Structure 1
Amino acid sequence: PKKPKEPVQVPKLLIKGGVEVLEVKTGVDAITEVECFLNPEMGDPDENLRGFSLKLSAENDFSSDSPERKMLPCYSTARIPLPNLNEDLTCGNLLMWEAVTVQTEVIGITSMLNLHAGSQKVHEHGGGKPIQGSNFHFFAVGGDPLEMQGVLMNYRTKYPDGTITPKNPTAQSQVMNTDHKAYLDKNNAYPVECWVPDPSRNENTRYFGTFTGGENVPPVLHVTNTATTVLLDEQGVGPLCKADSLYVSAADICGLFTNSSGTQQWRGLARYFKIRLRKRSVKNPYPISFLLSDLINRRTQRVDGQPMYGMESQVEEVRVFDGTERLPGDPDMIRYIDKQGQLQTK
């Protein structure tokens, strides 16, 4: 009979599955879609109370402030190992993965409608006080770890041992201080109150975040599977995965949970991620003399000689002779190249 119209050519799914699926030898124009999540690291004050913090210390002195480790929300971070694009390119070309498109979402937003759960009674015969207060929703997707900046308040706070902090803070550390650069290289260590992502150094990641701080503000959360964030820059490239690794970071403080006794503690939710990848032809920016210099420096013996480089060097004169010239009248002449051209002092 009458045949239907030909269906539109969609991309062909090869294999769906878990993380073991990435190993498939595909072609050049393959695209993968990694779907994952991150759990919030809110402090977890005992084994029964995951996702909350410990209760807040109310009024510490500004000089003798010493918080504890269980009441500090920290950043979440993770590395997704990607397989190598083992190819046979010419003239110093490669292939790397490119984070083209992220599609994120907070998992568990309607759980905040639980009002019969030890929350503070809202009025005389009311229900429970819902979760509200200062909230912070952050996510960062890139091919390198999240390079961040240590900016805090009250540099005289005595942090505990588990949390990694800005090293030797001064009064300058209560505003921008260039000495407090660090990476995000550890889950559940870097607290949110000390570490903002570095606006000067995240050349390979794409970090997005918003903050709203009040005594009682509404946590407004949208949930949708059609929103889509493009991770491309002005040149049309995304986060390139230098080492075959995809770095995913997040921080989702949703508000303060007020207990029945009137004692507040934080609340965090998970964060879905969906990164769309592809294979980018790049060039090798580095010469072959970086491969061979690393091979030699781990097979040749380390010699503790006399210093032949530095401020106490023992090499006195080096002269480079290339090409022929007419005989100059000054043998004790001095010759070099200043900025671009050959110069000749005396």
Structure 2
Amino acid sequence: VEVLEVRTGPDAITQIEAYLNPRMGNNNPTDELYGYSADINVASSKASDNPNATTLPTYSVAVIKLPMLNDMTCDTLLMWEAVSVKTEVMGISSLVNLHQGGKYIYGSSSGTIPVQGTTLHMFSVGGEPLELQGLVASSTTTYPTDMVTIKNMKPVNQALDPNAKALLDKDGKYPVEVWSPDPSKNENTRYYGSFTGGATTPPVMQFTNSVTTVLLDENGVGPLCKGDKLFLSAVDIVGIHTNYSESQNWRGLPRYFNVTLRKRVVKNP
């Protein structure tokens, strides 16, 4: 598809907003531990690793239908171009809480250890599903069958197997520990991610309504929404909550998006 100039004039710009709730494993809003994974079930050995589905954080994704733009026989057509995005992880302050049931910081007179450890933050804005690459810590892990993971895993999948590809086309089904953004593709999506590992690492997060991210590429072109559909994807693992018993649950937070779009001329394919 040959991309042409930006369409000017009145009504050329639009704005959408949305939020994606986290998918840490308890993914139904009636779940007692909604926003958390179930207690981590640890592998007995390399050969015997069977994580429960509810213990595995997955990517969130939503598809937004935009206003129809196009006569599909005219020489040029228009597409929605995502220009910029304001995005924020919501409910950061809920972590500022030392009375929750948990493990004591010192003895039984102290507060409880707050959520900490490994964090993973990612958002993407694209005109189609985020393209994914498969890679696991262990090729001998047996994943739950109703989740989307790598078929016919071999040791190569502990590194880069160019056959292990997928599209993020379902909310709450693609394990973060299996899939990551494919940098060899995603020509039509901008994605942004940061990771800090560790068992007990302090989480660090910002929040403001003053920051915007521009989505335009080196040529001045943002993601173009095929079939007038905008794709928002995210994961926001903000750490691990430990219970008194010492069992542990991933903690995630929801993400807000506010995307500005304009109208972009393309040559009819």
Q: CA deviation at 1:30?
A: 2.4
Which of 119, 128, 135 is 2:102 aligned to?
119
Match in the other structure for 1:36: 18
Which of 78, 82, 88 is 1:99 aligned to?
82
SS in 2 for 1:114: coil
Which has the higher Rg, Structure 1 or Structure 2?
1
> CA 1:54 to 1:88, structure 2 compared with 1: closer, same or farther past 3 Å?
closer
TM-score by length of 1: 0.72
User: In structure 2, how many angstroms separate the alpha carbons of the residues matched to 1:110 and 1:66?
Assistant: 34
Which of 142, 154, 161 is 1:170 aligned to?
154
SS in 2 for 1:179: coil
User: In structure 1, how many angstroms separate the alpha carbons of the residues matched to 2:179 and 2:241?
Assistant: 23
Match in the other structure for 1:315: none
Q: CA deviation at 1:163?
A: 1.1
Q: CA deviation at 1:89?
A: 8.8
Q: Return the letter of the residue paired with 1:39.
A: N
Q: CA deviation at 1:59?
A: 4.6
Which of 191, 204, 225 is 1:220 aligned to?
204
Higher relative contact order, chain-length normalized (CA < 8 Å, sep 6+): 2
Match in the other structure for 2:135: 151
5 Å-filtered alignment, 1:282-301, equals 282-284=266-268, 286=269
Which of 254, 259, 264 is 1:275 aligned to?
259
Match in the other structure for 1:241: 225
Q: Return the letter of the residue paired with 1:73.
A: P
Q: CA deviation at 1:61?
A: 0.5
Q: CA deviation at 1:32?
A: 1.2
5 Å-filtered alignment, 1:2-81, equals 29-44=11-26, 47-81=31-65
User: In structure 1, how many angstroms separate the alpha carbons of the residues matched to 2:47 and 2:88?
Assistant: 40
Q: Which has the higher strand share?
A: 2
Q: Which consecutive residues of structure 2, in runs of 5 or more, have no partner in the other structure? A: 1-8
CA contact (8 A) 2:52 2:144 kept: yes
CA contact (8 A) 1:29 1:279 kept: no
SS in 2 for 1:127: coil
Matched, 1:229 2:213: yes
Q: Return the letter of the residue paired with 1:33.
A: Q
CA contact (8 A) 2:129 2:231 kept: yes
1:118-138: CA deviation from partner (whole Å, max 9, x where unpaired): 121110121110110000001
CA contact (8 A) 1:100 1:231 kept: yes
Q: Which consecutive residues of structure 1, in runs of 5 or more, have no partner in the other structure? A: 1-26, 287-346
CA contact (8 A) 1:28 1:279 kept: no
CA contact (8 A) 2:147 2:175 kept: yes
Match in the other structure for 1:199: 183
Q: CA deviation at 1:242?
A: 1.8
SS in 1 for 2:94: helix
Paired residue total: 259
Q: CA deviation at 1:182?
A: 0.7
Matched, 1:108 2:91: yes
> CA 1:41 to 1:88, structure 2 compared with 1: closer, same or farther past 3 Å?
closer
1:79-132: CA deviation from partner (whole Å, max 9, x where unpaired): 001121136995x21111000001110000000012211121110121110110
Q: Return the letter of the residue paired with 1:79.
A: V
> CA 1:153 to 1:88, structure 2 compared with 1: closer, same or farther past 3 Å?
closer
